[PDB]
Amino acid sequence: PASPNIEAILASYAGFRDRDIEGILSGMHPDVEWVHPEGMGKYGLGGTKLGHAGIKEFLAHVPTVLGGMRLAPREFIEQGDRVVVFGTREVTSLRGTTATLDFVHSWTMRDGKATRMEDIFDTVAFHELIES
SS3 of the chain: CCCHHHHHHHHHHHHHHCCCHHHHHCCEEEEEEEEECHHHHHHCCCEEEEHHHHHHHHHHHHHHCCCEEEEEEEEEEEECCEEEEEEEEEEECCCCCEEEEEEEEEEEEECCEEEEEEEECCHHHHHHHHCC
Task: Return the number of other C-beta atoms located less than 10 Å from residue 30's C-beta.
Answer: 10
Query: What span, in angstroms and rounded, lies between the C-alpha atoms of 110 and 75?
Result: 21
Resolution reading in Å: 2.1
Q: Which domains does the chain have, with CATH numbers?
A: 1-132 (3.10.450.50)
Give bridge partners of residue 36 from the DSSP assignment.
47
Give bridge partners of residue 3 from the DSSP assignment.
none
Give bridge partners of residue 103 from the DSSP assignment.
87
Query: What span, in angstroms and rounded, lies between the C-alpha atoms of 24 and 77?
Result: 20
In single-letter form, the type of residue at position 54 comes to: G
Q: Which of 59, 121, 46 minimizes the C-alpha distance to 89?
A: 121
Judge contact between 125 and 101, C-beta under 8 A: yes
In single-letter form, the type of residue at position 62 comes to: V
